[PDB]
Amino acid sequence: GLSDGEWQQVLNVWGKVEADIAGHGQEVLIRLFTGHPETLEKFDKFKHLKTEAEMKASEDLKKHGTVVLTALGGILKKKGHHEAELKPLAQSHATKHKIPIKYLEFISDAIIHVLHSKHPGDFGADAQGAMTKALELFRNDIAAKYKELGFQG
Ligand code: HEM
Numbered sequence: 001g002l003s004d005g006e007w008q009q010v011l012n013v014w015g016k017v018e019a020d021i022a023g024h025g026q027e028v029l030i031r032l033f034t035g036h037p038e039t040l041e042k043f044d045k046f047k048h049l050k051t052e053a054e055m056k057a058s059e060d061l062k063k064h065g066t067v068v069l070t071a072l073g074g075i076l077k078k079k080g081h082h083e084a085e086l087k088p089l090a091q092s093h094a095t096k097h098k099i100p101i102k103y104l105e106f107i108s109d110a111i112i113h114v115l116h117s118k119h120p121g122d123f124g125a126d127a128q129g130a131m132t133k134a135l136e137l138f139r140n141d142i143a144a145k146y147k148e149l150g151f152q153g
Pocket of ligand 1: 040042043044068069071072089097099104
């Protein structure tokens with residue numbers, strides 16, 4: 001789906017995220033929850049936050065941000081050879097958490113936003129292109145598994 005040049009770019013940009021996984025994970029979820037409040041309702045653990053400050057002051061939220069970006073980075077490093085790591089993710093988000101693919105679209109966008117916000121001027125046009133394509137691949141692969149399950153919506 002990606003060329004090696006493009007994968008190269010994706011892992012170059014991920015090295016930025018690894019320098020501060022918690023801070024990046026934290027802003028991704030906050031971006032998600034403030035931009036799309038209905039997503040917050042999917043989490044009994046966080047439905048009590050109402051304000052962004054509140055969100056910002058939550059250590060549990062920073063904790064979950066780390067789990068999420070840890071699991072994505074594991075998949076990205078497989079450079080599309082992630083059937084093994086993705087299957088379990090697709091199955092729990094579909095049958096247990098009941099996360100529509102649209103919310104995966106949302107978080108995907110949130111990642112690109114956050115990268116530009118935290119690295120203004122050094123998140124280039126080529127890097128944005130490779131990252132967008134890798135997120136698309138990720139999402140597309142989940143979508144296939146959602147279809148298999150008939151997770152219709
Ligand atoms: C970048 C895409 C995502 C990744 C890598 C990711 C990763 C994870 C992981 C690894 C877990 C814990 C193990 C599991 O339950 O499978 C989890 C739990 C969960 N995820 Fe995701 N997630 C993503 C997107 C989303 C989105 C978009 C939503 C809702 C808008 C969501 C909702 C949840 C919920 C409700 C849980 C259970 C949390 C708890 O109560 O501890 N996830 N996620």
